[PDB]
Amino acid sequence: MTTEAKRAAKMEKKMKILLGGYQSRAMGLMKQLNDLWDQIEQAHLELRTF
Amino acid sequence: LICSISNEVPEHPCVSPVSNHVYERRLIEKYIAENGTDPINNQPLSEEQLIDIKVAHPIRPKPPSATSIPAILKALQDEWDAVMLHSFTLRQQLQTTRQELSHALYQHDAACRVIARLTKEVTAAREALATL
Amino acid sequence: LICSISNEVPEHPCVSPVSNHVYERRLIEKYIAENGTDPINNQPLSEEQLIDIKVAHPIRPKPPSATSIPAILKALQDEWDAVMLHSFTLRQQLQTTRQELSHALYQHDAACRVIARLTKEVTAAREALAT
Amino acid sequence: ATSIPAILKALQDEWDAVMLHSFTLRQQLQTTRQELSHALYQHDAACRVIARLTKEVTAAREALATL
Amino acid sequence: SATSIPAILKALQDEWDAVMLHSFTLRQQLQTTRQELSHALYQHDAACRVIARLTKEVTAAREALAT
Amino acid sequence: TDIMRNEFERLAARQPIELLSMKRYELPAPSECVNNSMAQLEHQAVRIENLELMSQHGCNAWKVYNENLVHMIEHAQKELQKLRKHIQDLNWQRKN
């Protein structure tokens, strides 16, 4: 628990510093994709309307 | 993300329905006009057989993340399937230690009967010689 | 890039040859066994008819706080919460839509009868000016 | 029965239905919205028929009345 | 079983909680069986040094008996 | 049209209550606990080995999956345009 979790916290905080930035980067992209998928349907719906 | 024919980032991806692989429309179109075939598997393919990449339909998706329920379930497989191999490292190493312990305790049990006889014989030789 | 059933980002996408649409293999395999036809186009489709499309192991990195503990407890719990509360909310969205459609049609009819009633009214009033 | 590996297999099998249910529920959701949209548009379109018709009918009255 | 689903959450929690200890208990036992094996190897090689001195006391006795 | 899964899922959503998970590992207490200790050790090992793979594994993939999400996004907005162009044409036609 001491040896491993100290390594884990070091591995985590080293990853977190590099990857919390890349998480934020990823999250935004995901959100954008989701939004787009939402506009896609309204345009398909309106296409089939018109 | 890539086109398999050129190696560029395709600006109009169209997926074929004979060898499942994302090709760039302008590149694959010329490949079909050369000969009606799929470049990878060399199976027959026409331009109408090729299909552009699309939004699914009406169900909204979200990007592939650690939260997502299916990605979280495939994660717990990795956890257990790795821990199952961790058990083999200790089951296999236990079968060597107990096998060396079995031969060690047998050599101990075969030897200590000879220590008991020499402690008898060397003291019996001292009991015999000192009396004379 | 997504699946056309669940709204996933598929790990092993497979395309059907009757209707060019990418589904995640597990979800399309389940539909064919339930009723052997394509979900979107309602065309005849079997498990052998499907064509797998290379994905080269879709990127899903394992979080920094990844252990057997959160993966068993916190992550797996959230996944069956998110499956449960979505499909229940999705079942709520179906019925509403149906009702809406019905009432829309109902309202629409009433206006048609007004127009038909006023189409006889107007032209005969204009005709009377001509006479 | 109370082991472990098949519990995850069972968790997959029940989710497999969850996805199949959400699909058929969404199809009818959007397919009904097309009827809703086409109706509301055509309703207010057919509504403008009346606005036009009413004012012409009205013009026929004062015309004939004053004549 | 028909089993309530909120309970199946706590089962999977308990089963991972159990397997974590069933993996732990099997590793500390491997370390102590190897540790107690190493204590036997010291006694094994220490005993065969003690036999060499006991053979000398027998060899010294066989010389004195001859005289 | 699902098995037992649908009964507990619909009941969980209707009642508005999520099934309780293992609230045990985090708290614990010093001075049964020989097992709980050995479970902790193994857990930590797994995390640390896993964490180490994840940083390096994560570092390698920390951005390789982000690139995939940009290829996925741009495809949706191309369809937004294709739909935009058809409908506009239709409207123009009607107007004319």
Author numbering:
A (entry chain L): 703 to 752
B (entry chain q): 3 to 134
C (entry chain r): 3 to 133
D (entry chain s): 68 to 134
E (entry chain t): 67 to 133
F (entry chain K): 63 to 93, 105 to 169
The authors write:
Pre-mRNA splicing, executed by the spliceosome, proceeds in two sequential steps: branching and exon ligation. In exon ligation, the newly exposed 3′-OH of the 5′-exon attacks the 5′-end phosphate of the 3′-exon, releasing the intron lariat and ligating the 5′-exon with the 3′-exon. In this manuscript, we report the atomic structures of the human P and ILS complexes at average resolutions of 3.0 and 2.9 Å, respectively. Comparative analysis of these three late-stage human spliceosomes reveals the molecular mechanisms of 3′-splice site (3′SS) recognition, exon release and spliceosome disassembly.
The ILS complex exists in two distinct conformations defined as ILS1 and ILS2. The ILS1 complex, in which Prp43 is yet to be recruited, may represent the conformational state right after Prp22 remolding. Compared to the human P complex, the overall organization of the human ILS1 complex remains largely unchanged, except that the ligated exon and at least nine protein components have been released. At least nine proteins have been dissociated in the P-to-ILS transition, presumably due to the action of Prp22. These proteins include four components of the EJC (eIF4AIII, MAGOH, MLN51, and Y14), the exon-stabilizing protein SRm300,27 the splicing factors Cwc22 and Slu7, PRKRIP1, and the ATPase/helicase Prp22. With the departure of Slu7, the ATPase/helicase Brr2 and the Jab1 domain of Prp8 are only flexibly attached to the periphery of the spliceosome and thus no longer defined by the EM density map. Following release of the ligated exon and its interacting proteins, CWF19L2 was recruited to occupy the vacated space in the active site, generating the ILS1 complex. During the P-to-ILS1 transition, Cwf19L2 is recruited into the space between Prp8 and the intron lariat. Cwf19L2 closely interacts with the intron lariat and four domains of Prp8 (N-domain, endonuclease, Linker, and RNaseH-like), which contribute to formation of the putative exon release tunnel. These interactions stabilize the conformation of Prp8 and the intron lariat in the ILS1 complex.
